[PDB]
């Protein structure tokens, strides 16, 4: 066992805030110094799980997170933590709402 243990994952590509509006698609991609690694997406402190809308794809050392029907509740803080390591990314999801002004009658 030589220079085998010593080592710690790294962050090649981090995630940046994503500005989206109601009924939109939010995608988050990153790059890690490992392909056999795996983590989960956390929103404002909540385990993000895939659904009929949300679609998570795993590609080598790259993670993807799709979010259909963007809601005003998705906005917060998207942090990904690769199980096994202590690393973590930082990304803020900005939710834009279509302000309503000048009501029309008829």
From Swiss-Prot:
Residue ranges of every copy of the Ig-like C2-type domain listed in the record: 8-100
Family: Belongs to the immunoglobulin superfamily. MyBP family.
Protein name: Myosin-binding protein C, fast-type
Residues of the full protein shown: 433 to 525 of 1136
Task of the protein: Thick filament-associated protein located in the crossbridge region of vertebrate striated muscle a bands. In vitro it binds MHC, F-actin and native thin filaments, and modifies the activity of actin-activated myosin ATPase. It may modulate muscle contraction or may play a more structural role.
Range of residues in the leader sequence: none
Native species: Mus musculus
């Amino acid at each position: 066992g030589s220079s085998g243990s010593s080592g710690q994952l790294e962050v090649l590509q981090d995630i940046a805030d994503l500005t989206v509006k109601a009924a939109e698609q939010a995608v988050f991609k990153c790059e890690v110094s490992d392909e056999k690694v795996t983590g989960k997406w956390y929103k404002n402190g909540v385990e993000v799980r895939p659904s009929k809308r949300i679609t998570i794809s795993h590609v080598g050392r790259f993670h993807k997170l799709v979010i259909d029907d963007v809601r005003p509740e998705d906005e917060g803080d998207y942090t990904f933590v690769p199980d096994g390591y202590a690393l973590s990314l930082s990304a803020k999801l900005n939710f834009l709402e279509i302000k309503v002004s000048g009501p029309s009658s008829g």
